[PDB]
Amino acid sequence: VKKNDLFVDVSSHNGYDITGILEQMGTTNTIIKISESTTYLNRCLSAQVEQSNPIGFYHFARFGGDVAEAEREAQFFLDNVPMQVKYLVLDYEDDPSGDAQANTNACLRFMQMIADAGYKPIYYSYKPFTHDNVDYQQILAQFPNSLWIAGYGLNDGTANFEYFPSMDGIRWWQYSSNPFDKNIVLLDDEEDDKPKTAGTWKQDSKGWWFRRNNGSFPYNKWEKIGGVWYYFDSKGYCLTSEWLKDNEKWYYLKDNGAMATGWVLVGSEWYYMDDSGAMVTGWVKYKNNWYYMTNERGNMVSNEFIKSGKGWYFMNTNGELADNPSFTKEPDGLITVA
Numbered sequence: 001v002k003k004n005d006l007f008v009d010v011s012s013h014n015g016y017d018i019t020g021i022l023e024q025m026g027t028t029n030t031i032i033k034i035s036e037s038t039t040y041l042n043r044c045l046s047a048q049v050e051q052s053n054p055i056g057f058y059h060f061a062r063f064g065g066d067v068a069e070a071e072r073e074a075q076f077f078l079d080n081v082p083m084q085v086k087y088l089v090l091d092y093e094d095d096p097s098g099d100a101q102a103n104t105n106a107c108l109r110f111m112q113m114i115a116d117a118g119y120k121p122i123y124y125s126y127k128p129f130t131h132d133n134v135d136y137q138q139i140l141a142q143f144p145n146s147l148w149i150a151g152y153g154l155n156d157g158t159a160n161f162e163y164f165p166s167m168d169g170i171r172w173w174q175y176s177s178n179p180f181d182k183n184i185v186l187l188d189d190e191e192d193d194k195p196k197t198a199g200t201w202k203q204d205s206k207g208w209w210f211r212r213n214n215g216s217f218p219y220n221k222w223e224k225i226g227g228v229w230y231y232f233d234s235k236g237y238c239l240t241s242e243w244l245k246d247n248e249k250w251y252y253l254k255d256n257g258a259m260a261t262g263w264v265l266v267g268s269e270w271y272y273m274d275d276s277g278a279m280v281t282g283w284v285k286y287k288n289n290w291y292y293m294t295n296e297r298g299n300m301v302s303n304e305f306i307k308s309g310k311g312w313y314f315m316n317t318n319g320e321l322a323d324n325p326s327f328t329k330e331p332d333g334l335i336t337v338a
């Protein structure tokens, strides 16, 4: 998954049919509960798996500060993973021991066994509980950006950045549980490795061109080199800092020719692109600030409104906010948090 992607988490509480809540949410990405302690298995597992696209599974911990118990739970969890997924989550929110360092150690041993089994470990919890019962920093030192924290606020079923949990290493944010558990992604999944490419980059007075292994080179086309996309001139030079209309959709190629994804500052205007590079028009919120973007007839416009208190103030590109707010009631657009 990519930044701002959504996913739902479920357990027996959601029953053998979750097609409805996946439709309401608008995604099939799910993290399903497999086990609890060393004896409980979520009965709806296979059904919930079948009805969605799992990105991970979670275990409800009951080991407290006992490392030997955490090991037995991790193993029971592992022995029941039904299919390969990138993540296996440690849901630590109950029965903490009075000894925070012991809680941390058991949590670390649990996460370590998940990592040794070939998965990316995730620590799930709530800020206050984590603050009182463990040293999440000691966890991040061994497992960077491995946190999945919950923080609902009003819990009205929507993502409200005003109540966004402040902690380092937060990978996922469960922003609500109102109807069902809703989560939004803050960091792209990792992909360390994939070294070398299928050619060599060449630079010169005219810019950069790519010499493929066989001597040829891309031109008048898009092409994925490394993990990123680029568009090449009819001469084989990749575009830089430029807009490109391709197939009725707009794309922006950054300073390094790399196709933009997510938020990107062009000049002094903000624009938001699909995970596939296509510009997204209309209302889109970046954290606390709202942007109404449009590209009709190729006229790129970014209407910025900075939040201040209980209001949003329009900011004319002349660098000045109005004296009074433009709106105190947020529009119903795409919410992004990173």
Ligand SMILES: C[N+](C)(C)CCO
Pocket (backbone or CB within 6 Å): 201, 208, 238, 256, 257
């Ligand atoms: C060489 N570029 C700057 C064009 C990008 C890939 O390294």
Ligand SMILES: C[N+](C)(C)CCO
Pocket (backbone or CB within 6 Å): 222, 223, 229, 246, 275, 276, 277
């Ligand atoms: C389709 N593009 C080549 C424009 C990029 C997304 O894969």
